[PDB]
Ligand binder design. Structure first.
Ligand code: MG
Lengths: 469, 414
RNA sequence: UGAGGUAGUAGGUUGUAU
DNA sequence: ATACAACCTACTACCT
């Protein structure tokens, strides 16, 4: 006998100032906010990879359908959506020979092979960036499936064919940060899933019914990396800054340390959205402790406030901090020693470790998305993942898990916090889907941290997201 | 001044909706049979009246489905007659959108006409349409995407919204209805190393500084601790549990949080002992323990006609639940569902990878109703009376076998 | 590593008080 | 260094 409140689905804004609930429908209807003239693409890989990428680029121009056009909207083609040309005629190839991959891939040490392959790719990319006249917006790296299989941290090479992190993606994106090259990594089995079949004569990955969804996600990621704005939030307040704090364990360092990384979300004076990472991962040397020291917390808050002031010109009225952990007294005391008296500091803990599953008794479908169970004035549950009436299906697979949102520190209306989190679940530029589960601040801070802790050290890293996602 | 779009109704709907909404957003009056959610009595007569009296252009969606469709052909003939009447050569503008239809297999009605190619690119085709409309002086208004958004909301989304309706959900929380009157700290001093095993005793007991936090009587431990036969009841600290749950205890003897944690530990230990007493099989996870049943222990594995044990491909799958106890926000027992696999009826698989793969394979086709029914069936199986089930704590703890129901004021229409 | 979701497996920390 | 609860990350495998 308890009451669940409902939070209306937030609306995102598109071209012509038109609001919509679905990113795909809004893009196919009105278009992106930006005006890109075209995407000039550089391709790195074998000749087979270049052929696969050319075939996919020619395929993506034509409309692509899903099995059901209500559950999954169909792709009407790249130029029919984004109003810009992304063709195979603007491709700037850079060949990586198969013997080059064979020389480095087959090694007893996984670290050495990962370093060698990453160096082989990035050296060509950097040389083409510096010593060529052609302009490249995004560099597409068509990695063969063997590299992906054998370059994971826990991968073991069978004896039949026999610092930095032993991961191809993280090391590749971390060693390319000093040059600010937005790059997109594809696997050959992704763009040509038909040709990679198992012993049963069927493709290992089946994209027959979700081809349009794959095209949507790939096109949105490529458009965002080239410098486009697909959509933005529409129903958020003014004078409020959203933060995020994610801790990642650093393994390259001899002493285990915890690096805290942030993502900052707010609005500018031109009604646009400013969403970029707050970086320089602040280090806690004590293993197993996920709380910042007072000086690190002071530096973090000072940097965030300085960025906000330099962007707008006035200190934020409110600052919301989202984290998967719980702030202690020292962290918050350090935080209050820097923020001005006019600024309100709220520290919210968002977790997904509370197993409260709600089962609907009148069908085979799950609980509606957006339903919230307010435990008290400082604790509530939110169903960010669940049945969505628009797509006539649920974002989960069996039964969704709830997001336990608790206002750890400060004073705020928990209804407003739930509204903010549900709105932030609509800003994932890495994919073209409906709203996701995690807030975008936490997810993108995690994405940044996964890369900034995959190298020994790095100078002041870029704030832009196209260099990480 | 209208623009008529003729198409196969259920087959060419995606392109027709796209083009109609794009043209509406650009300032054109578009007449399409999908832009009307409610259809009137007079359809064909109204269609002919629209073609003869209203439209200034006739866009035909030329595809494989629309090649020899009776309605499309009838509209084509009426449009040809209208074009002859108005002495306009370019009244009918076909749109080639299907790659399966060759340019030599188009019907007689449009075999002589200059078409617009949408096969390679929809954007190029739309640009061609707009250029032709501008060149031929087709009437239009000022561009306004708000009209397109409004039409999309009205027609293509009216049956896909949230309706206000009472809904009842069943959770996985079993509220603890009755609690023991009080908690006892038994200061037994040494008591022969105070039963060093601790966790192996019949009754749930934990070791404090020099005390023993229990809910049962002191003599109950005489079976495992003979010395406690001479233990005196005078060394007992009584503490009121109902007052503890309200956060009333203070002072330096013990903290309220410590009391709540100790109560949680006692409840979890008691639950483990009761489940061990219920003759059920146990599986050790990475951080918890789950309880499952065997092949033929139920007749016939259809408790309340819900099924608990089944046959996937070559192994027998058994339902399971794992439990804990929490005081946040109110005293509840919190259980979670799991699926385990055995090679035979009474066996187990030591390979964790195959267990994970089989669990993921089976989770794909179960859904909320089967999940809830199996959870409720297991809970009812563990029940001991009409509307509860008890666990040993003389003293005992009763937990309801009916999960707490939540109520919402919004829902959907399946 | 197109992207989410759901699970499983390891490890560590914290006020305790043996 | 044991037991416990209460919070934390890293790393896979599978479905769509
Ligand atoms: Mg990406």
């Amino acid at each position: 006998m308890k009451e669940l409140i409902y939070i209306e689905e937030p609306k995102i804004l598109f071209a012509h100032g038109q609001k919509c609930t679905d990113a795909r429908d809004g893009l196919a209807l009105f278009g992106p906010l930006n005006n890109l003239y075209g995407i000039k693409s550089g391709v790195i890989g074998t000749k087979q990879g270049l052929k696969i990428f050319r075939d996919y680029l020619d395929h993506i121009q034509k409309p692509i359908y899903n099995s059901n056009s209500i559950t999954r909207p169909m792709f009407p083609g790249f130029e029919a959506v984004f109003d810009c040309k992304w063709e195979s005629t603007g491709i700037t190839f850079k060949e990586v020979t198969n013997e080059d991959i064979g020389k480095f891939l087959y090694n007893s040490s996984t670290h050495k092979r990962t370093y060698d392959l990453v160096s082989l790719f990035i050296d060509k990319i950097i040389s083409a960036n510096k010593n060529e006249d052609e302009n490249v917006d995004v560099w597409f790296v068509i990695v063969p499936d063997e590299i992906y299989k054998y370059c994971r941290p826990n991968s073991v090479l069978p004896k039949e064919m026999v610092n930095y992190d032993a991961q191809f993606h993280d090391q590749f994106k971390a060693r390319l940060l000093k040059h600010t090259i937005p790059t997109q990594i594809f696997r050959e089995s992704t763009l040509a899933w038909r040709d990679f079949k198992n012993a049963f004569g069927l493709p290992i990955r089946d994209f027959s019914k979700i081809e349009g969804h794959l095209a949507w996600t790939i096109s949105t990621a490529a458009f965002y990396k080239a410098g486009g704005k697909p959509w933005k939030l529409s129903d958020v307040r003014n004078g409020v800054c959203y933060l995020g704090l994610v801790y990642k364990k650093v393994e390259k360092s001899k002493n285990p340390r915890n690096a805290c990384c942030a993502a900052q979300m707010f609005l500018d004076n031109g009604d646009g959205t400013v969403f970029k990472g707050e970086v320089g991962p602040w280090y806690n040397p004590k293993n197993g402790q996920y709380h910042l020291e007072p000086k690190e917390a002071k530096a973090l808050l000072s940097q965030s406030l300085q960025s906000y002031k330099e962007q707008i010109g006035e200190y934020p009225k409110e600052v919301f901090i989202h984290a998967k952990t719980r702030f202690n007294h020292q962290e918050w005391d350090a935080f209050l020693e820097v923020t001005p008296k006019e600024t309100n500091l709220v520290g919210v803990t968002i977790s997904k470790t509370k197993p409260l599953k709600l089962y609907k008794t009148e069908g085979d479908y799950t609980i509606l998305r957006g339903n919230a169970y307010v435990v008290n004035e400082r604790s509530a549950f939110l169903w960010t993942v669940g049945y969505v009436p628009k797509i006539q299906t649920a974002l989960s697979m069996e039964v969704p898990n709830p997001l336990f949102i608790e206002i750890n520190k400060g004073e705020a209306d928990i209804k407003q916090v739930l509204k903010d989190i549900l709105s932030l679940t609509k800003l994932n530029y890495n994919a073209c889907i409906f709203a996701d589960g995690e807030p975008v601040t936490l997810r993108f801070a995690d994405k940044i941290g996964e890369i900034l802790t995959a190298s020994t050290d790095i100078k002041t890293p870029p704030l832009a997201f196209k260099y990480y996602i | 001044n209208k623009i008529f779009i003729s198409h196969a109704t259920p087959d060419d709907n995606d392109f027709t909706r796209w083009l109609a909404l794009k043209l509406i957003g650009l300032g054109y009056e578009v007449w399409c049979d999908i832009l009307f959610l409610d259809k009137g009595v007079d359809f064909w007569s109204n269609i002919e009246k629209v073609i003869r009296e209203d439209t200034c252009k006739f866009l035909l969606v030329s595809s494989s489905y629309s090649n020899q469709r009776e309605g499309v052909l009838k509209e084509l003939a009426v449009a040809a007659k209208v074009k002859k009447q108005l002495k306009d050569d370019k009244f009918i503008i076909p749109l080639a959108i299907d790659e399966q239809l060759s340019y030599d297999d188009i019907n007689i009605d449009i075999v002589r006409l200059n078409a617009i190619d949408f096969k390679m690119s929809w954007a190029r085709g739309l640009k061609d349409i707009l250029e032709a409309f501008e060149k031929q002086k087709v009437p239009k208004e000022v561009a306004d995407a708000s009209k397109s958004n409004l039409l999309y909301q009205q027609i293509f989304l009216h049956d896909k919204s949230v309706i206000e309706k009472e809904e009842i959900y069943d959770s996985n929380w079993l509220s603890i209805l009755s609690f023991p009157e009080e908690l006892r700290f038994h200061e037994y001093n040494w008591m022969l190393p105070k039963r060093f095993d601790v966790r192996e005793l019949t009754f749930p007991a934990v070791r404090y500084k020099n005390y023993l936090c229990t809910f049962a009587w002191a003599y109950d431990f005489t079976y495992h601790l003979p010395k406690t036969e001479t233990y005196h009841k005078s060394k007992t600290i009584r503490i009121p549990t109902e007052e503890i749950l309200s956060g009333s205890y203070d002072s330096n003897f013990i903290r309220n949080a410590e009391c709540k944690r100790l109560i949680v530990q006692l409840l979890n230990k008691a639950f483990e002992l009761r489940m061990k007493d219920k003759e059920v099989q146990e599986y050790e996870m990475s951080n918890k323990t789950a309880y499952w049943l065997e092949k033929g222990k139920l007749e016939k594995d259809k408790f309340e006609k819900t099924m608990l044990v089944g046959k996937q491909k070559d192994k027998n799958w058994h339902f399971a639940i794992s439990g804990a106890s929490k005081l946040y926000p109110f005293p509840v027992l919190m259980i979670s569902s799991h699926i385990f696999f055995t090679a035979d009826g009474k066996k187990l698989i030591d390979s964790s990878s195959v267990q994970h793969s089989s669990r993921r394979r089976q989770g794909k086709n179960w859904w909320n109703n089967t999940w809830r029914t199996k959870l409720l069936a297991f809970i009812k199986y563990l029940s001991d009376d009409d509307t509860s089930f008890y666990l040993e704590m003389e003293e005992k703890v009763f937990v309801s076998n009916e999960p707490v129901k939540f109520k919402g004021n919004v829902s959907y229409n399946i």
